Structure formats: structure tokens, C-alpha cells
Design a protein around this nucleic acid. Structure first.
Lengths: 87, 153, 371, 203, 119
RNA sequence: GAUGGGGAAGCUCCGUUUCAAAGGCCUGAUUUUAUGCAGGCCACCAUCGAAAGGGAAUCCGGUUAAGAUUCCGGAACCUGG
RNA sequence: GUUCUUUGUAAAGUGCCUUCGAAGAGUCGAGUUGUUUGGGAAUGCAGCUCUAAGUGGGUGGUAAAUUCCAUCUAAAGCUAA
RNA sequence: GUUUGACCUCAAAUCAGGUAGGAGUACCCGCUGAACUUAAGCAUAUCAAUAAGCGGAGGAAAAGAAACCAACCGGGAUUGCCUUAGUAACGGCGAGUGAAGCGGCAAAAGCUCAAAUUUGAAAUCUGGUACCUUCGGUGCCCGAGUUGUAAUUUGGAGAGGG
């Protein structure tokens, strides 16, 4: 049952009580190798845009007309702004 | 850098000086098409590698102890002869059908005698281009000379 | 202390640029981008940029210096260096030739794997079952699309097997609560031990590689999520408690290649959707999509026979016949005839609707998402 | 073998083949540093007989030394003494240049021990020597009984005490009537024969 | 007076740390008394008690460290034998009893025979 | 006055930016070879050498057997984040 | 002294016959300069110029040539008292 | 092929592991090197191949199995003592300087490369790593090495063939 130290000297052991607590915690060699995962990894990535994973339900196949019309009407406003800016 | 300067100038230094005739017989050499045909022949006669050698030792123990033989069950080995001292020794017997001599080699004095020695004995020698090429066929980095003494029917 | 100099401290310390990261790691940019997905270190905005970059206003990617100091160790990073040598020593073997030494070098090597980096990033099972949502989309994406350069077959044939494992667990253990067909494929929803998991299977249609999109990112994400879903499927199978990984019958696989292949084996349900369609036998026709129907009929426990299977080569016990043609001829008096809309509408309520509605060649009630 | 062809050909130094090599090589060596590491022997045959072996922990080192006489370092060319001291440039130095070459690489490469040295080329200013050194810490040397003797700490700095081939010539150690003043040591036999022995019962 | 070594070896590592801090507090209490007094004989024992505890903590640590480095080439230089410098250099029994293959045959064929002059 | 170098049997001597590969910055789906670094930019030189040269920023009042532009009270300024 | 393994048609020595029997170069040697010795016409060492042979080479304490005889086998190395 | 790849030489790492310096210095191995002094006052000489200066070692060092001494009915690695001897020899053949062979004893011990094809198999070796009986051993894997590592052979001999 092996263990890596901070120093990285690979050694086979039986019973992980047998190794002392000071040796695994503190540094014997100059180039010690982690242990502690930082705070700054655990925070989330920054929301650019808003992605909505739930679909619109106009996009259904066999939709109801009140939804399907409201799907077209909202993106027609997106498009016609760009066509105005184009012309 | 100094090392780059010196190696370029050394090359230049050789060409500007008149060179003695025994040297610079080298640099006249086997052509690419003839050289290509030479290597076909030699690669078929590649020597047994270290991995194969290990395998061959295990196979002989299984056969030889149980039935018979002095390792004589194993067939004849045909391969090229790479050591300079060995090939010079092969010449003068004289057993060697072809000798290939690399054009390069840092001592130079090492191989200057070999063209003349081959002529006197009457071995059919050649001066193939590059020592690293000779190395490849014989599983060495560089081989200096390579001679083929025997041949399949 | 003396006067202290400016661009050492603060924002200037906290962040570093991708140039500086890739330099300090000494990795190169191809393989820096991979490690930042395995870890994963994500890019940042500093609030005051002109402090951070000396003081360019200029478009830049910053990273947190501490995140790259944690990356600097990391026993994957060694196996990237070990590969770099292995490639160099293979080129020598070929470039002497000397082939069998390269054939040895092929065998004697140890490919990196992410197992430590999974179980530190997600400790553990409710945390992973949170994010496994994001994995399932891309595996079902990459399972469908056709093999090329920039992809190769083995990556896709991994993803097919890893997904067809996931379907068979959900079909056996019966967790399909919301269904929603769309134009963009089919969304499902499944309540795998507490948290609910939405995921999108595309329709099986032969399309299409744009060649704007970078695969040399997305294959690393796929390689990460393939190993993630291995460790989840290992746990889910044994806790159920079936054997992992499940063996697959070949002569079955040569009929359809899908969910009816794979067979699951050992060492009443949460209701009400599971044990719909019990004592209930479907004969699905040729025209309909087998790949999204058999899944829902097995995962809401009932029996299927397909027309699509028959071409390889009973109708005794069959109750229902799913078909969606304009005209149909001739129909049997005992059998019920419906359109696959019925199956999608039944599951979302979990009532069983009347089959007087629907039926060919009639017009429909609409569909409605459950969201 | 290479042996006889190389040995014989090396002796013909003023042959046209060898002098071309001599002229080309001296220029090459002069561009490089005074002491520097040589990748292999220039003369494989000559190193082999002096006891180079092509295995790990056998080192060759090329070195350059100024020709000519030993100047005394008195200031302003001034004697301060009798006119027996004579001209200052005509003092000669009792060790060779070959031996001075072994000492300089000995001080550079202190972990190694100097086995031998062989002459390679010369020029009006500079002689050139290729020195052959052995590493006694390397385990190929320490194992195998033919070269473990050099690991023993009596053989620290052979060159400095003058136990190399060049040094034993310079001290003047051979057998016979010619070498009476120096045989067991020059200062030893001096100290022996210029000392009054006196026994208890006086002879 | 004060602590004994044979007692401390049986105690665990967490107990020895608590033992040391208790003695160090008790030392600091005594040095406040010492400046008021001429003389304070108890202070000699408690400083030697501190030294006894530190020695036992070190000796427990090192013997554990020897056992996890046991049975492998290379180990820390303090754990290697000191000897003297020249004996640290210079040939081991294997690198010395080692003899060339010609010499090995010659000793088998012709060793130093045992004999005596009389009859 | 080290280093790179060069002298000297040698203790060491010359030389100080010199006949040195003398580091640290930007960009990168460098677009295909599908798990290996590519394309560029910049240009002299270790260190020591001033309690009187150069140099960020503090004043008043109080206080001690013996201390203060350094403690106490109040009122200021400087540097970096 | 006791006790366990035996390795081995393995390794090493010995007689007679018959072809081979390889052996160290800017070295040896000589000239000149300085030094050194009891070494004397040059004992040893060093620099600089010249520089060999293989039935050869060195030495044989008086100068050379001619012809003999004797004696060792250099220019690589280890080793207790 | 305006590409990819073999080698050669030369670099760089807080790369893996080693090692050198300084002290002591009576004795030992080298280098360098005076003068006082003694000779009539002295430039040969002598003091002295000495003191001071510098380099390098060990319990001893150095020396060592003859390119020796001899001219005998020849001896037989090296060192030391007694003797050879105040002799041969050197020197204003002045002052002075000054060996060696044999002989008797103390102690005694011999050997190794280079150079000859293993060519029916580089048979050789460092390192890493996994186990073990750990001054080390076995297996697997990177390398060194044919511009030559092992075995056989050192002139007393010897090798191959019978």
C-alpha cells in the first residue's frame, strides 16, 4: 500500500498509521508537491451571455399556435433590428 | 558561436589547401543509384539483434537438452561483419567478397590504408558515402567499415 | 522598507497572461490548453486591467497565478513529457528501420489517465451527479456524427458504448419522468438518486461537420467526460446491483445495434411512470424511429417488437401498433392503432390518456413541454 | 587488426599524408581553448597501449603548453648576487612540458586521476598533448580488478609527485651504474650517505 | 526529580507534545520567581525534563523514519553511517575481494599448499 | 573587483565589457498530419566603493535620578496595495 | 573439530610431433645550450634543431674506424616485509 | 523532398547520483633556490643539489621483478645495516669533494596490459525500476560499446592443429 510524500519519494508500506504525521505534512525536500487544493479553483467560471438550457416549446414539433407564433415574433424583432442596421 | 565558426572554417580550410593524393581518393565515391542497389543486398543480411539473441538462447535450451545436438540444430548465421579489426583480419585470408568503407571518420588515418590494402590483396572494395548509413544496417550508431563474407545460394 | 516598486504587488501578482503561463509551465500551447480543461483552470477578468497588464488596455486572457502554481506539479504533466520522448525514440526506430524495435516500443508504454483528477475535482457522488448533466449531451452528440480526420473511429465507438451503457441502466432501473421531443432531437429527464438530469439525444441523421469548430479542444472535454461517466456507471451498476461493465450479445448487436443489445445481470419501483405499459406489448412499425421509442417503452416497463429488426431474419401477444403513415391497410380487429405522440403525451402526465384520440390518419392535440 | 598499419603509418611523420593532417589539426586545436575535452582519441592505437580502454569512466583531455625556456621572475632583469647566476632566459626547468601538461588538466579535473599522456602535435609557440584520465568513483572502474588499484588513495595526484612515465624519466629512475645519484630517490640517497651513523658500542 | 525516559517511550506522540507545553509554561513561571530571588533550585530539573521529552520525541520519529526507508538504495545522509571520510571513500569488500578471471583459475589450480619438514 | 578568457613550475597575476551560445518579452484552432513548439521582438553586462556628495515623508507641547524630531497627548505628512 | 550441498565426460596442469611465436616513435640515438654529478670529453636532467631500425636495439665508466664476443630486451602498468 | 529523418561536434538544466578544495605537515615524493661561511683578500670552488618559497601523499611513502651487475667454475626484483673506503674519481689535482660492483646479514613474493578474428553469434559493463538471503543478488527496461568491451596470451614464454 504505497504513499507519495510531499517530496515525492515513492515507497511501499503496510498500515498508513505506520508513517509519521510530521513527515507527510512537513517538507523534507525543497520541491514539495501540493496537498492543498486552492480556494481559487473552487469558484465558478464567469457567465458570459445567458445560456438557457430549457427549450422554448415553440421548438417542439407539432406545436400550439400561440407558442409557435410567439417564437417567430421575438426573433423577427432580433432580425429586423439587424436588417435596419444593414440597410 | 565559436563552435559553428570553427567547423565551417575547417571545411573551408580543407578545400583551399592542396591535399595529398592518398587522402581525397575519398570524396570520389559510390553513386546514389549504385549505392541504393548495394544497400538492398546488405539489409537482407542484417545481423541478429539483442532481442532476437535473447529469444534464440531460450529456444535452444528447449530442443538441445531433451533430444540431441550441440546447438547444431540451429541453422547457419549469415550476416555482415562490422568491426574494423575483424574486417582487416577477414582481408588477407582472404575471405571477404565486398568491403564498404565510409568516406568520413574523425581520425582519418584509421581508414587511409584500407583502399591500398584491399588493392594489394585483391578484395573488391567500395567507398560508400556516410558512416551513419553503415551503422544503420549493422545496428550501430556508426560502423566505419562493413564487409560481407558469405551469401545465401 | 524603502520605496517599493509598482507592478510587483496586487492585481499585478494575482493574475498572469497565457504567454506567461505557457512559458512558466514550459509546456507549449497545444498541451497547455488540454491541462486547463483537465484541472480545469478557467480564464478571468481582473477588475482593474491597466494595473494587471503594466498597463496595456489590450485584449488578453488572465488566469489566477495560484491556479497555475497548482497545475505546475500534477502527475499528468509528466506523462505528457514521457510521451514527447517516446515519440522521439519511435522516430529513431523507424528512421533506422529496425521495425520490430518500434513494435516493442509501441507495446511497452503507459498512457496517462485522469482518475485522481476526477476524484479530487468531484468529491464525490452527489457532486458528480450534479455535473454529469453536462457530460451526457456531448457523448450523445459525438456518438452520432461520422468518423473523419480530426476525430477517428475509436473515440466515437467509445462514446456509443458509454452512452448505450447509460441508456440500459435507465431502461432497467426505470427513471424517465419528463420526455420532450423537439426539432433539435429529443430531450429527456431522469431522477438518478435525488437530483434530476436533463439530456439531449439527437435524431440519427447523417450530419454534419462545419469545419469552423475546434475539435482539438472538444475531444479533450470528451476524453475528460468519458472517464467521468465510467466512474459514475461503475458505481450505479454495482449499487443497483448488477455487474459492470456489462457484456453484449453479438448476434443481437447485428440486428439493430442499440439498447436491446447489452445484457445485465446480478451481483418494485418508485412509481408511477415505471409500470406504465405493464402487461402491454408494442409492435412498432418500420417507418417510425426505433431509437427513440424502444427506450421509453423498455424504461416504462413493456415489451417491444420492431419491423426494422425483421429484414435480417409471431404477432400472437401484440396489443398496440405504433404507426405514422397517411393510409394504412389492412388493420386487425383485436389490435389498437396509435401514433408515437401517444407515448410522449402519456409519460409527461403519467396517467395513460385515451387512445380514441390520436390514431392514423388523424390530426393531433398539440404536444406541450413539461417546463 | 588496425594495430600495425596505424603504428607504422604514425611513425612516418614527414610523409606528405601525415604532414597535411598535422597542419590542418594544429589550426583546429589553436581556435579552441587551452585545456579542453576531446570526444575520442586522435590516435586510438597510442592511447590503447598506454592503457586507455573504451568504456565508461575513461576520459581524454587535449591540452596546449608554451614552448621554450624557463624565465626567472626576478624584477627588472636584476641578479642581486654573484655572476654565476648568469643570463636569465637560459634557465631550463627540470620537469618536461609533457609533465606540465599533465598537471594543468590534473588541477582542472580534480576528481579524476591522470593515468598517462601522449604527444600529438607542435608549433613554434605551442606543443600539444592528449592526456588520458580515469574516473575512480565510477563503478565500472571500481569493480573489475585490472583498474581498481587506481582507486586506492596512494594514487592521488600521480602527476604532481611524478610517478607517471614522463615524471619517472625526469627524476631519473632506472637500474644501473649510470643512475647512482638518483635511483631510490635523489634526496633520499643524499640524506642516507650524508648522515653520521653511531652505534652503542662504537666501531 | 522530574520525568523519566522509560515512562515517556510508552506514551503516544500527542501526549508528549502536551507534556512539553506544560513544562515550558512551568519553566516560564519559574523565571519570574528567579529574578526576585537570589536562587531557585527547582529550575534545574524542569529544563532537563524538557530535554528528556525532546530526545524521546526525536528518537520515536527517527526509528519510524528508518523503517520506511528500509530495504532500498539511497537514504538520507544523517541516516547513513558516519564512520570517517576516508573509510566512506575506498573500496567495499566486494570491490576488493573481486579478482580477474585468470587469477581465479590460478588459485584453484595452484593454491598455497600446507606442508612441514620432518617425516 | 569575480565571471569569460589568457599568462604562471606555483603561492596566484592580467583584465572589466573585454575575441563568450553571458536572458526575457509578445503572439499563437500559425490548420491540419490529427497525443512531440511554431512565428517573431528587444539589445549592455556581476559586485563593492560616501553615518559630510545624491536622497519619499514629523512638528509643537508634556515627561525621566539618568531617555526622546524615537515615549505620552494632540496635530501632520510619505510610500505601496 | 562438526554439518549440509556435491560440481564435472566441467576447468587446470603434464609428454611427444608440426606450422606459426605478433613485443610499445617527435621515441631511442645525435648535435648544441643551461644545469647537475666522483663520473674524468661529458654521469643524469631539461629546452631548441635533426630524427632511426627489426637476424633489430641498448649496455660493456677513454677518443674514432674495422671485425668479434658477452650481456640484457627500453620508449605502458601493479605489488606486502 | 523548399519535407522528414539518421549521425557528428558543441551546449544547457536548483536534471539523477557522485567527487575536488581546507586542516595537520616529524617522517615521505617532486619543483624552486640563496647568502653568511671556508679558501688570502676572490669572479672557478665551498657552504649546498642545504635554509626560506610552492605543489602532492600515506601509516609509512618512494623503490621494485632487469634494455641490471659483470668478465667468474659467473651472479639474478626492490629497500636497509656492516664492509667495500676516506678507495677509484673530481678539484687555482688548492681549500676541499667523494661513489659503486662483489662479500656477510635483516626481509623476501611475485605479476598485468598493448600487439595475435569469439565471428557459429559483445560471450562484456554503468544506470533506472520491481522483488530478495542487501559492503550485494535475480528479472525486465533505458543506454555505453565494433574508431573494440570480455575470454585465451606477456617473452620464464606461448597459440592453433595432431
Amino acid at each position: 500500500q504505497k504513499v507519495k510524500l510531499p517530496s515525492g519519494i515513492k515507497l511501499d508500506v503496510e498500515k498508513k498509521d505506520q508513517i509519521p504525521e510530521e513527515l507527510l505534512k512537513k517538507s523534507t525536500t525543497s520541491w514539495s508537491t501540493a496537498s492543498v487544493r486552492p480556494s481559487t479553483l473552487d469558484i465558478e467560471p464567469i457567465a458570459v451571455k445567458e445560456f438557457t438550457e430549457i427549450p422554448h416549446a415553440g421548438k417542439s414539433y407539432n406545436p400550439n399556435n400561440k407558442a409557435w407564433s410567439e417564437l417567430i415574433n421575438k426573433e423577427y424583432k432580433e432580425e429586423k433590428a439587424r436588417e435596419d442596421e444593414r440597410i | 558561436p565559436e563552435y559553428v565558426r570553427v567547423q565551417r572554417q575547417k571545411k573551408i580550410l580543407s578545400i583551399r589547401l592542396k591535399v595529398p593524393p592518398t587522402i581525397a581518393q575519398f570524396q570520389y565515391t559510390l553513386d546514389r543509384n549504385t549505392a541504393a542497389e548495394t544497400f538492398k543486398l546488405f539489409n537482407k543480411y542484417r545481423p541478429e539483434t539483442a532481442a532476437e539473441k535473447k529469444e534464440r538462447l531460450t529456444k535452444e535450451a528447449a530442443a538441445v537438452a531433451e533430444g540431441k545436438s550441440k546447438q547444431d540444430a540451429s541453422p547457419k548465421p549469415y550476416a555482415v561483419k562490422y568491426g574494423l579489426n575483424h574486417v582487416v583480419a577477414l582481408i588477407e585470408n582472404k575471405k571477404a567478397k565486398l568491403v564498404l568503407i565510409a568516406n568520413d571518420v574523425d581520425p582519418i588515418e584509421l581508414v587511409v590504408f584500407l583502399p591500398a590494402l584491399c588493392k594489394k590483396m585483391g578484395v573488391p572494395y567500395a567507398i560508400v558515402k556516410g558512416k551513419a548509413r553503415l551503422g544503420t544496417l549493422v545496428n550501430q550508431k556508426t560502423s566505419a567499415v562493413a564487409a560481407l563474407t558469405e551469401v545465401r545460394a | 522598507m524603502r520605496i517599493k516598486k509598482k507592478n510587483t504587488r496586487g492585481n499585478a501578482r494575482n493574475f498572469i497572461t497565457r504567454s506567461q503561463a505557457v512559458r512558466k509551465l514550459q509546456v507549449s500551447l497545444a498541451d497547455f490548453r488540454r491541462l486547463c480543461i483537465f484541472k480545469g483552470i478557467y480564464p478571468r477578468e481582473p477588475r482593474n486591467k491597466k494595473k494587471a497588464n503594466k498597463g496595456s488596455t489590450a485584449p488578453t486572457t488572465f488566469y489566477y497565478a495560484k491556479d497555475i502554481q497548482y497545475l505546475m506539479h500534477e502527475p499528468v504533466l509528466a506523462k505528457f513529457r514521457e510521451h514527447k520522448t517516446f515519440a522521439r525514440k519511435l522516430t529513431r526506430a523507424l528512421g533506422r528501420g529496425e521495425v520490430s524495435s518500434a513494435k516493442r516500443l509501441e507495446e511497452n508504454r503507459d498512457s496517462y489517465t485522469l482518475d485522481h483528477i476526477i476524484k479530487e475535482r468531484y468529491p464525490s457522488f452527489p457532486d458528480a451527479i450534479r455535473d454529469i448533466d453536462d457530460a451526457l449531451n456531448m457523448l450523445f452528440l459525438f456518438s452520432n456524427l461520422p468518423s473523419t480526420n480530426q476525430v477517428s473511429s475509436k473515440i466515437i465507438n467509445d462514446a456509443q458504448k458509454i452512452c448505450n451503457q447509460w441508456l440500459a441502466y435507465v431502461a432497467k432501473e426505470r427513471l424517465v419522468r419528463k420526455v420532450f421531443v423537439s426539432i433539435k432531437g429529443v430531450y429527456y429527464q431522469a431522477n438518478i438518486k435525488g437530483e434530476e438530469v436533463r439530456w439531449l439525444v439527437p435524431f440519427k441523421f447523417p450530419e454534419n461537420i462545419p469545419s469552423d469548430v475546434d475539435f482539438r479542444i472538444m475531444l479533450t472535454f470528451l476524453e475528460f467526460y468519458s472517464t467521468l461517466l465510467h466512474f459514475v456507471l461503475y458505481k450505479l451498476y454495482t449499487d443497483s446491483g448488477l455487474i459492470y461493465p456489462p457484456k453484449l450479445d453479438l448476434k443481437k448487436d447485428k440486428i439493430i445495434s442499440g439498447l436491446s443489445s447489452y445484457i445485465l445481470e446480478s451481483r418494485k419501483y418508485d412509481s408511477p411512470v415505471a409500470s406504465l405499459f405493464s402487461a402491454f406489448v408494442f409492435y412498432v412499425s418500420r417507418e417510425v424511429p426505433i431509437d427513440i421509442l424502444e427506450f421509453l417503452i423498455l424504461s416504462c416497463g413493456g415489451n417491444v417488437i420492431s419491423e426494422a429488426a425483421m429484414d435480417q431474419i409471431d404477432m400472437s401477444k401484440v396489443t398496440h401498433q405504433i404507426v405514422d403513415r397517411p393510409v394504412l391497410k389492412n388493420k386487425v380487429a383485436g389490435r389498437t392503432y396509435i401514433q408515437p405522440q401517444w407515448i410522449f403525451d402519456c409519460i409527461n402526465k403519467g396517467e395513460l390518456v385515451p387512445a380514441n384520440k390520436y390514431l392514423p390518419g388523424e390530426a393531433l392535440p398539440p404536444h406541450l413541454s413539461p417546463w | 587488426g588496425a594495430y600495425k598499419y596505424l603504428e607504422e603509418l604514425q611513425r612516418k611523420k614527414q610523409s606528405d599524408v601525415l604532414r597535411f593532417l598535422q597542419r590542418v589539426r594544429v589550426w583546429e586545436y589553436r581556435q579552441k581553448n587551452v585545456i579542453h575535452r576531446a570526444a575520442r582519441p586522435t590516435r586510438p592505437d597510442k592511447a590503447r597501449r598506454l592503457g586507455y580502454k573504451a568504456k565508461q569512466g575513461f576520459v581524454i583531455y587535449r591540452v596546449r603548453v608554451r614552448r621554450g625556456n624557463r624565465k626567472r621572475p626576478v624584477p627588472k632583469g636584476a641578479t642581486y648576487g654573484k655572476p654565476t647566476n648568469q643570463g636569465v632566459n637560459e634557465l631550463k626547468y627540470q620537469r618536461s612540458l609533457r609533465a606540465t601538461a599533465e598537471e594543468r588538466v590534473g588541477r582542472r579535473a580534480a576528481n579524476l586521476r591522470v593515468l598517462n599522456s601522449y604527444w600529438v602535435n607542435q608549433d613554434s609557440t605551442y606543443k600539444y598533448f592528449e592526456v588520458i584520465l580515469v574516473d575512480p568513483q565510477h563503478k565500472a572502474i571500481r569493480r573489475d580488478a585490472r583498474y581498481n588499484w587506481i582507486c586506492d588513495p596512494v594514487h592521488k595526484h600521480r602527476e604532481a609527485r611524478g610517478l607517471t612515465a614522463t615524471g619517472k624519466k625526469s627524476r631519473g629512475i632506472n637500474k644501473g651504474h649510470k643512475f647512482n645519484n638518483t635511483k631510490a630517490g635523489r634526496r633520499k640517497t643524499w640524506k642516507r650517505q650524508n648522515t653520521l651513523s653511531l652505534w652503542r658500542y662504537r666501531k | 526529580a522530574g520525568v523519566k525516559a522509560y515512562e515517556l517511550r510508552t506514551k503516544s506522540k500527542e501526549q508528549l507534545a502536551s507534556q512539553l507545553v506544560d513544562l515550558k509554561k512551568e519553566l516560564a513561571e519559574l523565571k519570574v520567581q528567579k529574578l526576585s530571588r537570589p536562587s531557585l533550585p527547582k529550575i534545574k530539573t524542569v529544563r532537563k525534563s524538557i530535554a528528556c521529552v525532546l530526545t524521546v520525541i526525536n528518537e520515536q520519529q527517527r526509528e519510524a523514519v528508518r523503517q520506511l526507508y528500509k530495504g532500498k538504495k539511497y537514504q538520507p545522509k544523517d541516516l547513513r553511517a558516519k564512520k570517517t571520510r576516508a573509510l566512506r571513500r575506498a573500496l567495499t569488500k566486494f570491490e576488493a575481494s573481486q579478482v580477474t578471471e585468470k587469477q581465479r583459475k590460478k588459485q584453484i589450480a595452484f593454491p598455497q599448499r600446507k606442508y612441514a619438514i620432518k617425516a
